[PDB]
Amino acid sequence: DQPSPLRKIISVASIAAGVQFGWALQLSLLTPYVQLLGIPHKWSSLIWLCGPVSGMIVQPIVGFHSDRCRSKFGRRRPFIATGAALVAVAVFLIGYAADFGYKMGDKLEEKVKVRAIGIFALGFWILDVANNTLQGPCRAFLADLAAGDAKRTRVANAFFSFFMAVGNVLGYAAGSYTNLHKMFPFTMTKACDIYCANLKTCFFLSITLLLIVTVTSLWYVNDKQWSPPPRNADDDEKTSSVPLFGEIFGAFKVMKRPMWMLLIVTALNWIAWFPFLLFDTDWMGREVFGGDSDGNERSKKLYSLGVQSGAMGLMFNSIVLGFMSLGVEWIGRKLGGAKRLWGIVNFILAAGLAMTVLVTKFAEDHRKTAGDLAGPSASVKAGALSLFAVLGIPLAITFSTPFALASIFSSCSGAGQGLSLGVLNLAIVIPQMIVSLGGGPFDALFGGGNLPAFIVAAIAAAISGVLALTVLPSPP
């Protein structure tokens, strides 16, 4: 009960930059790679869905096992190290899938390159398992360093979100820079495109940054070897359970009122966020710029242009995220509580999701005066990018406050940090599958386009604000 200094908590929070780099990398390089491999869109949907499913499975099991690690290296360091090593292996397998597939039998003038697709899928599965092995114990290790100090936990998670934004900016700048392959001239082969070579170079830089921020962090911070308390032969803790739902249901039944209310507020928060976070680039390429991936060559060109402009919007968003993360705790304190700031920024999210309709109206008006395939004006561009920028404020709270509150409640109750966070992750990965599988049908139900999902998400965000301000209990 005597906290490790801030220097070590921030050293542990700094690994989020190296983790987020490897994902932000892929925004403008994964789609051309999927085109190059020729993966059928149904198989692509399955590969993508493997993400949230693996988040459902790995997170609680890893949390429950990390809370009982008993290793000499600590409760959290072994899992983080294993996750980073598996990230390295997954990078190696994803970047080189096309070249192996070619050298193993794939034909150059054949659309569906089978062997390359198999290697690609194995790589992403390893990466999913690695990410879900890493995420839990790292924030749990922050919670261990805080040793019951609520303010220290809040500061730790604010810095975690800050480093996430740092890694996002770095990966967005690398992934969108053509001619990066000039670093390694032999990245381009007969089966590897220029974007493939940029992907390889970005993955090299990813392994580099990850080693840099991880080795130093795990040598620099000591992880305290855990000792289990003595037990009888007739105890539940030395008794086997259901393989996967054992940890989840055990978490749910030792649970408190505050944890239930926090999970509800977080689930509604992510049901609000994921429509935009999943369909924003399509909204930009379709509603805002005009054009479809199908149709005449200009409309395909305009769709590509809209997607690029959306990537720039996300860049602005991450910059704003990083700047807000540094003031989260002070602003929350002066407002009289972190959940107060949560509730307040959720209404900003609601209004921002509402502004989408006005942007779309301005774009159709310009398209009527200047032509259907004339593209947007500078005003429509500026407005869409301003929306992307402003939305960075609530995302900073979403990336910090819920995990900190989970940790504080689990410290008061004694639940266990790793498994509390692994169960909190359900309120993120279940809305993800709901939105990804029901967005299209829901939009079609209400006329088409992207906007109905955005209006329902705005209402959900306002409801999240109300509940965070009223039903969510304050910490002790």
Domain edges within the chain: 6-471
| The pair of three-digit structure tokens given for residue 216, joined into one six-digit string | 């130093």
Query: How far is residue 389's CA from residue 313's CA, in Å, rounded to a whole number?
Result: 7
Q: What is the resolution of this structure in A?
A: 2.7
| The pair of three-digit structure tokens given for residue 368, joined into one six-digit string | 């009527």
Say how many C-beta atoms besides its own lie within 10 A of residue 174's C-beta: 21
Query: How far is residue 65's CA from residue 86's CA, in Å, rounded to a whole number?
Result: 18
Q: Residue 427 carries which side chain, given as an amino acid letter?
A: A
Say how many C-beta atoms besides its own lie within 10 A of residue 107's C-beta: 10
Query: How far is residue 262's CA from residue 67's CA, in Å, rounded to a whole number?
Result: 21
Q: Which of 81, 89, 99 is nearest to 122 (CA)?
A: 89
Q: Which of 461, 403, 312, 435 is nearest to 16 (CA)?
A: 403
Query: How far is residue 442's CA from residue 449's CA, in Å, rounded to a whole number?
Result: 10
| The pair of three-digit structure tokens given for residue 209, joined into one six-digit string | 């940054």
Query: How far is residue 230's CA from residue 270's CA, in Å, rounded to a whole number?
Result: 41
| The pair of three-digit structure tokens given for residue 169, joined into one six-digit string | 């900016």
DSSP letter assigned to residue 239 = S
Which distant-in-sequence residues (6+ apart) come within 8 Å of 3 by Cβ?
145, 146, 147, 148, 149, 152
Q: Helix, strand, coil: what percent of the chain each, to 5?
A: 75, 0, 25
Please give the distance of CA 206 from its chain centroid, rounded to a whole number.
16
The CATH architecture assigned to 6-471 reads: Up-down Bundle (1.20)
Please give the distance of CA 47 from its chain centroid, rounded to a whole number.
16
CA distances from 98 to 60, 124, 200, 311 (A): 34, 14, 11, 25
Contact 343, 468 (CB under 8 A): yes
Please give the distance of CA 102 from its chain centroid, rounded to a whole number.
32
Say how many C-beta atoms besides its own lie within 10 A of residue 371's C-beta: 10
Q: Which of 427, 435, 421 is nearest to 261 (CA)?
A: 427
